[PDB]
Design a protein around this ligand. Structure first.
Ligand SMILES: *[C@@H]1O[C@H](CO)[C@@H](O[C@@H]2O[C@H](CO)[C@@H](O[C@@H]3O[C@H](CO[C@H]4O[C@H](CO)[C@@H](O)[C@H](O)[C@@H]4O)[C@@H](O)[C@H](O)[C@@H]3O)[C@H](O)[C@H]2NC(C)=O)[C@H](O)[C@H]1NC(C)=O
Ligand SMILES: *[C@@H]1O[C@H](CO)[C@@H](O[C@@H]2O[C@H](CO)[C@@H](O[C@@H]3O[C@H](CO[C@H]4O[C@H](CO)[C@@H](O)[C@H](O)[C@@H]4O)[C@@H](O)[C@H](O)[C@@H]3O)[C@H](O)[C@H]2NC(C)=O)[C@H](O)[C@H]1NC(C)=O
Ligand SMILES: *[C@@H]1O[C@H](CO)[C@@H](O[C@@H]2O[C@H](CO)[C@@H](O[C@@H]3O[C@H](CO)[C@@H](O)[C@H](O)[C@@H]3O)[C@H](O)[C@H]2NC(C)=O)[C@H](O)[C@H]1NC(C)=O
Ligand SMILES: *[C@@H]1O[C@H](CO)[C@@H](O[C@@H]2O[C@H](CO)[C@@H](O[C@@H]3O[C@H](CO)[C@@H](O)[C@H](O)[C@@H]3O)[C@H](O)[C@H]2NC(C)=O)[C@H](O)[C@H]1NC(C)=O
Ligand SMILES: *[C@@H]1O[C@H](CO)[C@@H](O[C@@H]2O[C@H](CO)[C@@H](O[C@@H]3O[C@H](CO)[C@@H](O)[C@H](O)[C@@H]3O)[C@H](O)[C@H]2NC(C)=O)[C@H](O)[C@H]1NC(C)=O
Ligand SMILES: *[C@@H]1O[C@H](CO)[C@@H](O[C@@H]2O[C@H](CO)[C@@H](O[C@@H]3O[C@H](CO)[C@@H](O)[C@H](O)[C@@H]3O)[C@H](O)[C@H]2NC(C)=O)[C@H](O)[C@H]1NC(C)=O
Ligand SMILES: *[C@@H]1O[C@H](CO)[C@@H](O[C@@H]2O[C@H](CO)[C@@H](O)[C@H](O)[C@H]2NC(C)=O)[C@H](O)[C@H]1NC(C)=O
Ligand SMILES: *[C@@H]1O[C@H](CO)[C@@H](O[C@@H]2O[C@H](CO)[C@@H](O)[C@H](O)[C@H]2NC(C)=O)[C@H](O)[C@H]1NC(C)=O
Ligand SMILES: *[C@@H]1O[C@H](CO)[C@@H](O[C@@H]2O[C@H](CO)[C@@H](O)[C@H](O)[C@H]2NC(C)=O)[C@H](O)[C@H]1NC(C)=O
Ligand SMILES: *[C@@H]1O[C@H](CO)[C@@H](O[C@@H]2O[C@H](CO)[C@@H](O)[C@H](O)[C@H]2NC(C)=O)[C@H](O)[C@H]1NC(C)=O
Ligand SMILES: *[C@@H]1O[C@H](CO)[C@@H](O[C@@H]2O[C@H](CO)[C@@H](O)[C@H](O)[C@H]2NC(C)=O)[C@H](O)[C@H]1NC(C)=O
Ligand SMILES: *[C@@H]1O[C@H](CO)[C@@H](O[C@@H]2O[C@H](CO)[C@@H](O)[C@H](O)[C@H]2NC(C)=O)[C@H](O)[C@H]1NC(C)=O
Ligand SMILES: *[C@@H]1O[C@H](CO)[C@@H](O[C@@H]2O[C@H](CO)[C@@H](O)[C@H](O)[C@H]2NC(C)=O)[C@H](O)[C@H]1NC(C)=O
Ligand SMILES: *[C@@H]1O[C@H](CO)[C@@H](O[C@@H]2O[C@H](CO)[C@@H](O)[C@H](O)[C@H]2NC(C)=O)[C@H](O)[C@H]1NC(C)=O
Ligand code: NAG
Ligand code: NAG
Ligand code: NAG
Lengths: 763, 763
């Protein structure tokens, strides 16, 4: 509630339905908590700052607070944060509290009984006692990880007294990652659901370690006795490179377990007895181990019928280069398997019969096989994997056939990189491979491919319309980081159903001058929608115009359009005129010092998104914008403009997203925003503007403005801008960083003063 | 003769034995020829400048000139250079003349009969007539190439009248490269020795084309009907991709031919009848052709018993990936073959039996096989090639086994890149290959290897002293652009005879902090002489000191020595102290803002070459140089020093090569060079110095100075430096760019004035 604040430098978000008020003071360099904080707020953000300590009077009048965040307030900085006694007892409605990165020595006392979450990561608490945990009898989620490890050493092994967590009957999630823990803290409460003991120094597991945990769902034991070969981070192998000793009858009481992580445990064998009782396991991680021989046997896979995810990445043997992948026949028992990763299983040749166990997996979607240094791989063997969604053929050497400060979620699963080409259907990610030329015979029996990534292959070829013949249903093609010779306009002609084409980073042949550059090759593409050819350094073009009846988006950044539009050369003025359906242009970083007269007349009639960022436009004309009757998102950021148009209404009748970020403008015209009621977005940040007059900023236009930025510039706070001073502190226009970034240059003592906090009584 | 010049801005070189005087005015921006040119000069250099034309009075008093160079005086610039009539008749002793890059339309007339060389490259002369060549009856070398091609088009085919060169009885070398020539200009004089007709549009060769040439030694026919696939430069294939039609009885009259180039001719067959008469052929070029099938036959090789060089690079077929290299059995007839290049013959697997024809070549030294995309290659097959000097295993994908403005020489042969490792003996250049780990078994039967290049392989391995076991006689090892984990001090221990080690560009594992970095691994290397570990970004080291009893040169540039020598950290102060025999150090680009006191005491006793370039030394102490009793070549270029030492004699008693290039020094001490008789080299260029006093620059010290630089700085030419003005124009000290780079800041009209050309009579 309370809607209107007075001088708070933190953003306020109101949710009437949720009855939640959010205050975000992230990255504000506040030495002390600012005054005037509303009593109706629910979430308080007090992240990285210069707060010396915490006082009971800080939250004296705040009784509705339900979330306090104090993450990374002192990253190892002055002395450690000190908390006065009874500093949290007054928050009866408190439910969540974060104290990560505060260099605390012991668990704070006096916490309210209503607390449900407590985070104490990146601290110096290496001792756990029941006396300090007595007050936390109603806690549900506990985060005590990253207290003693290589980044934040403490030189003392973690000590937990007997039955420390036993009386925490409400505990559900416990994390002890990177805490130098040697022994699992028995006895954990029976209500635990997620346990995170990974990246510790645990060497053995007892048979009664998880005897009472029946509701556990997620168990993590990574980093115990890890595989330290070629590790880019400090780690200590266990002795004799022994594996993490886990008894056969260890996961017996676990019946609701769903996620089990054993990554980087130096395991050599996986007994089937482990998975005898856990019949509902969904995700299993076994990466960074020594299970190369176990993959050939994989006898334990017969006890996982409901498995969804299986990770076996980077299990290669030392000084061993396998001739082929030895997949066990027990892989056919993974009926519900969806994602499979066999990376780091480096081998020479991949054959069709080696993937036979995966032929009957109906629910399999993703097959990851990248980073395996595969030399010989017949692509026609994938004709049986039509139901697969993503097939990974990454940096391995396949060649053509011959003749705590952020992330409030804390413990979260690894989110897979959702590439832009996955949404189009079947994907064959052949990026960074050893393919140096394209044959139509190689891609035979692959008409089902809706996607094909070939970035980084460094292919030097002159396509004439026959290489991608079998790819009849291809919709997305990636050809970045290659050497494409556009000597013919018939390239990609046989890709009838292609929609998006990426030929970026092909600067090699485009840099050479005097050779033909057929830029009209998009005419044959009937259903092409997006074309990305940026960072190509295109300086000449044999074709006068580019023709396309369906292209809508075109990226032409990082090229040389100045030479194409050189003074006295009108050949390429109407280069984009024939693109009738084009709606977005991205001609940026083209070293365009100036725009010759006539280019705007040659722009497509349906242009709607024009960008000229980072170009260096010394003088950009504005009366020529009348030609563009559909322009809405003109962008001139990071340019060297110096003059605003006399009347924006006379320039464009539809511009609504004008941007002039990081420009050099010292003053605005007296009628800059006169009768411009169609404008919605305006940006003038990072400029050299001095003052704004009333006649240039009418309130009628400013009322409908969604967002306006005037931060990080050189406004002068003198008596000549009383109207501006009154308006900035009495309007509802959303101006970000109003009290943090925009300051006053002068005069004299007014350096660094906040405009919204200015009250010139003498004026 | 004449020894002493007056105001010439060109360097003068005297050779009394050769009676030659050389004047070099290269890159001087001279609008007109300067006055005071000696009459005794022999060679005149008048390269790229702003000379408008040539007048007869330019060489009026010069009668001893024997060489005039006028190369690239106007690169397509004002209008073309105009030569007045009878502008060269007065040079009776002229023998050589260069007029390249002058946009001349016709051959200049009135040349003296004593001329022997004439260069007219990069001009607009596309018509040749006997009338203009009548005056050149005594010429020997003619250069008329690059007159009409893609860089300098003329849109007209070259026209040569019948028997134009017939009467040039003294002609020996003729070049017509890139001249758009269609037909060979019959009839060439019988005294021709070198003919250069390459990069032309010749489509056919007549049987009488070379009927009279019996003394010809070098013949070039490249670029005629060229192979235009993947060409980074403009080219036009002949029609029907027809080959250059050469009759069988074409090289019949040629008996002294030694070099024949047929590179890029789209040839398909090489008849043996071509080489029936040329029994003394030494170098043969057949690259960029379609002789992939001909290599399997190679019937013509039986007629080349005296061949020395054979080039067959880049003859791969389009859309064909050969399974193996098909070398003909006729290769055994090349008894005298020394260098063989089979690059661009892309094939999958290389076997031992495929190199059988080369097993009996006693004189074979270099075997080039790079850029072939070889996948499988057993390195043990090279045990039979012990006599070979260089074996090329370049960017192909071999993996470990599984289970006119310059170049006055004009027409010159392609100089092979002499790598630094070739001088050590047998070389196995395995750079940029697909090797990702090293096994001792792979390098078996290779104990004869004196060199091994492994740069760019990106090998991630933790060597412990057993990988390079069979390489007992290895002396040079290259490991640049890799990922070396120095977790053990026993690395390279088994390389007993190693002398030079290069572990540069291994920044990956060295960037990580907290992992061990055993920098004392050089102790085991008993005979190590040079160690290059630059660009490694080394910021921490587990070993306190580096020990080596034989290391003499150490490159440690592009690292982080500031953190190692951080204030309050004296652990790594004596890092290089134990290097007893070290004589050269290259610690540069280390971001060293300042040198903590004590590092000089920890320097090796026998240090002689110290470099601190591009470091950013805000304040470098000088009294600590007394510790180094053997310093001679101290370098502080591209630094931010501001104060010179009070007395250089008191600092170092052996410094003789002090360098302060691109520094920021405004003034020198009044006793900077007092009693410093041991100094030989001094550099103060690109500084902010204002004036020099007499007491700081005694003549006794300056007499023995070999070289001194005071160019491109901010000297002020007022009346306060009369002594300096007198001394700079009356001393014999070699001061480069004395009248071209060093100018006067002021005062007033004295901007840009030459100090050596200053005469202040009013002073
Ligand atoms: C202001 O502070 C409030 C608390 O003081 C915040 O309310 C919290 O909001 C989160 C959601 O953002 C709730 O989390 C719930 O989690 C359960 C369990 O889901 C678990 O599993 C999923 C994966 O399937 C995982 O993503 C979750 O993180 C959990 O691990 C869900 O079923 C719920 O729908 C909900 O997501 C908290 O319970 C809730 N706390 C309280 C006390 O209600 C509020 O978000 C804060 N607002 C801002 C703007 O920061
Ligand atoms: C000043 O101008 C003088 C002429 O006006 C220059 O004298 C010339 O010097 C060059 C050497 O630099 C002489 O070239 C001769 O070439 C023959 C034939 O060798 C040929 O083959 C070799 C490869 O085996 C090749 O490298 C050569 O370039 C030749 O193509 C050699 O046998 C000789 O030893 C010598 O190298 C000229 O003959 C000579 N000209 C005259 C008229 O004597 C002088 O070099 C100029 N000085 C400077 C500093 O520029
Ligand atoms: C995780 O806990 C283990 C518990 O052992 C820590 O190992 C201990 O580390 C300290 C500090 O390096 C060792 O103290 C050392 O003692 C030697 C004398 O033996 C002394 O010369 C050193 O200066 C240092 O004080 C201690 O011995 C060692 N414990 C054992 C059993 O070896 C480990 O450091 C902890 N990890 C982190 C990141 O804090
Ligand atoms: C085809 O495959 C290539 C390589 O696998 C993909 O390129 C990679 O795309 C990812 C995601 O866009 C890039 O990650 C990003 O890197 C930047 C730094 O450049 C970082 O700031 C981002 O946060 C993100 O991590 C990755 O760099 C890029 N790799 C290269 C070599 O460009 C490409 O996206 C694939 N194409 C399709 C259509 O899936
Ligand atoms: C090397 O010599 C050949 C000799 O044929 C040159 O080919 C000629 O090039 C000119 C200029 O492009 C052509 O003139 C053209 O004529 C057409 C009408 O046919 C006109 O529309 C053009 O505007 C141009 O004026 C000429 O036809 C052509 N000759 C032949 C037989 O095709 C070639 O250009 C020369 N190469 C260089 C680098 O100068
Ligand atoms: C081992 O093989 C590698 C690659 O074949 C050699 O590196 C290459 O060395 C040459 C000659 O030093 C470099 O050429 C130079 O390039 C610079 C530009 O960086 C240019 O300014 C010079 O004029 C010269 O052309 C080449 O760049 C370099 N390649 C790489 C990737 O570094 C290496 O020298 C070999 N080692 C031994 C001991 O022979
Ligand atoms: C694939 O892996 C399986 C299981 O490790 C291998 O089968 C074993 O092979 C060894 C060596 O011959 C025998 O001693 C075992 O008795 C075999 N066990 C079983 C259950 O068959 C198999 O040889 C591997 N195949 C390949 C090609 O490496
Ligand atoms: C990859 O596999 C496919 C199919 O298994 C092979 O296609 C065969 O090609 C030959 C010659 O073109 C035909 O005679 C066969 O009938 C094809 N097989 C089928 C099932 O139709 C292809 O040759 C394989 N690739 C390589 C390099 O061997
Ligand atoms: C596209 O390029 C391919 C590759 O060169 C052409 O295929 C060749 O065509 C020529 C002329 O008909 C034949 O002599 C070759 O035998 C063909 N090679 C192969 C491997 O088939 C193809 O004709 C070109 N297409 C167009 C329209 O230019
Ligand atoms: C793209 O433009 C080029 C010209 O820049 C077109 O090439 C011309 O094609 C016609 C028709 O065959 C020929 O008569 C011309 O001689 C060609 N000119 C050149 C310079 O090659 C090409 O056809 C265009 N492609 C498309 C698909 O429109
Ligand atoms: C290596 O090259 C030789 C010469 O081109 C090949 O020998 C020819 O092979 C063809 C095809 O079988 C025959 O028609 C010719 O009669 C052969 N000529 C001779 C002189 O033998 C040979 O087959 C090639 N070998 C490989 C493995 O490609
Ligand atoms: C590369 O060639 C060498 C020699 O030709 C092979 O060395 C053989 O290795 C086997 C098993 O180690 C021995 O039984 C043979 O006696 C060796 N040959 C000789 C001549 O001694 C080596 O195996 C080959 N590499 C590969 C990958 O096959
Ligand atoms: C250097 O590293 C190699 C590779 O690990 C070591 O060779 C292994 O040594 C262990 C211990 O003796 C054996 O169990 C392995 O069988 C060996 N592997 C191979 C491929 O031989 C070697 O011992 C190490 N040497 C030193 C001095 O540490
Ligand atoms: C290089 O220096 C390291 C120390 O930085 C040496 O490692 C020590 O070796 C001794 C002898 O075995 C051990 O007692 C120490 O515990 C080792 N210290 C560490 C930190 O590992 C290493 O031996 C040195 N190598 C050489 C060749 O001198
Ligand atoms: C123009 O581009 C911006 C870029 O963020 C986008 O937000 C906007 O929706 C685009 N406008 C149209 C009409 O597509
Ligand atoms: C020191 O290095 C320079 C670098 O050019 C070299 O010329 C000089 O000979 C070296 N001095 C000694 C004594 O090796
Ligand atoms: C400087 O040199 C003079 C003359 O040799 C000597 O007397 C004096 O002690 C020296 N001072 C230092 C600090 O070296």
């Amino acid at each position: 509630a309370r809607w209107f604040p007075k001088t708070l430098p933190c953003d306020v978000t109101l949710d009437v339905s949720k009855n939640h008020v959010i205050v975000d003071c992230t990255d504000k360099h506040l030495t002390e908590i600012p005054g005037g904080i509303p009593t109706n707020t629910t979430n308080l953000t007090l992240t990285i700052n210069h707060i010396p300590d915490i006082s009971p009077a800080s939250f004296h009048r705040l009784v509705h607070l339900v979330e306090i965040d104090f993450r990374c307030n002192c990253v190892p900085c002055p002395r450690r944060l000190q908390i006065k006694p009874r500093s949290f007892s007054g928050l009866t409605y408190l439910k969540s509290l974060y104290l990560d990165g505060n260099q605390l020595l012991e668990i704070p006392q006096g916490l309210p009984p209503s607390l449900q979450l407590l985070s104490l990561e990146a601290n110096n608490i290496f001792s756990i006692r029941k006396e300090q945990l007595t007050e936390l009898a109603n806690i549900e989620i506990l985060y005590l990880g990253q207290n003693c490890y290589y980044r934040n050493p403490c030189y003392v092994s973690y000590s937990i007294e007997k039955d420390a967590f036993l009386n925490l009957t409400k505990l559900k999630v416990l994390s002890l990652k990177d805490n130098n823990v040697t022994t699992v803290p028995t006895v954990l409460p029976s209500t635990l659901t997620e346990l995170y003991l990974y990246n510790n120094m645990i060497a053995e597991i007892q048979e009664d370690d998880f005897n009472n945990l029946n509701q556990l769902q997620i168990l993590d034991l990574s980093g115990n006795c890890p595989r330290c070969y070629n590790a880019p981070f400090p780690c200590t192998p266990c002795k004799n490179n022994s594996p993490l000793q886990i008894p056969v009858n260890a996961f017996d009481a676990l019946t609701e377990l769903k996620v089990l992580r054993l990554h980087s445990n130096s395991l050599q064998h996986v007994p089937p007895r482990w998975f005898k009782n856990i019949n509902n396991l969904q995700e299993l991680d076994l990466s960074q181990n020594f299970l190369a021989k176990e993959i050939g046997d994989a006898k334990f896979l017969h006890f996982l019928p409901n498995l969804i995810q299986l990770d076996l990445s980077f299990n290669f043997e030392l000084q061993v280069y396998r001739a082929s992948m030895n997949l066990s026949q027990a892989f056919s028992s993974l009926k519900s398997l969806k994602i499979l990763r066999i990376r780091g299983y480096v081998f020479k040749e991949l054959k069709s019969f080696q993937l036979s166990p995966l032929h009957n997996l109906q629910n399999l979607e993703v097959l990851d096989l990248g980073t395996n240094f595969i030399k010989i791989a017949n692509l026609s063997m994938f004709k049986q994997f039509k139901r697969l969604k993503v097939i990974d053929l990454s940096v391995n050497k396949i060649s053509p056939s011959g003749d705590s400060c952020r992330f409030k979620n804390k413990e979260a699963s690894f989110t897979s990189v959702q590439e832009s080409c996955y949404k189009y259907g079947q994907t064959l990610d052949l990026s960074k491979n050893s393919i140096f030329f394209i044959k139509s015979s190689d891609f035979q029996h692959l008409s089902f491919l809706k996607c094909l990534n070939l970035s980084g292959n460094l292919i030097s070829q002159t396509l004439n319309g026959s290489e991608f013949q079998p790819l009849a249903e291809l919709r997305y093609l990636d050809f970045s980081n290659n050497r494409l010779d556009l000597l013919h306009s018939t390239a990609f002609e046989e890709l009838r159903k292609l929609e998006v084409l990426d030929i970026s980073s092909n600067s090699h042949y485009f840099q050479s001058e005097g050779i033909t550059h057929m830029l009209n090759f998009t005419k044959n593409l009937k259903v092409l929608q997006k074309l990305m050819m940026n960072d190509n350094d295109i300086s000449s073009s044999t074709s006068r115009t580019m023709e396309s009846e369906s292209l809508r988006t075109l990226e032409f950044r990082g090229n040389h359009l100045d030479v194409l539009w050189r003074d006295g050369d009108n050949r390429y003025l109407q280069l984009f005129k024939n693109l009738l359906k084009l709606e977005e242009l991205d001609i940026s970083k083209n070293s365009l010092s100036f725009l010759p007269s006539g280019v705007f007349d040659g722009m497509p009639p349906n242009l709607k998104n024009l960008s000229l960022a980072k170009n260096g436009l010394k003088s950009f004309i504005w009366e020529k914008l009348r030609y563009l009757k559909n322009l809405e998102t003109l962008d001139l950021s990071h340019n060297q403009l110096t003059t605003v148009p006399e009347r924006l209404s006379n320039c464009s009748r539809s511009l609504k997203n004008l941007i002039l970020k990081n420009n050099q403008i010292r003053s605005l015209t007296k009628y800059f925003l006169q009768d411009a009621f169609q404008l919605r977005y305006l940006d003038l940040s990072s400029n050299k503007i001095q003052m704004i007059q009333k006649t240039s900023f009418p309130e009628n236009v400013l009322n409908n403005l969604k967002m306006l930025l005037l931060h990080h510039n050189r406004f002068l706070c003198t008596c000549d801008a009383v109207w501006f001073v009154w308006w900035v502190q009495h309007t509802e226009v959303t101006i970000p960083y109003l009290a943090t970034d925009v300051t006053c240059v002068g005069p004299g003592a007014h350096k660094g003063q906040s405009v919204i906090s200015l009250d010139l009584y003498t004026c």
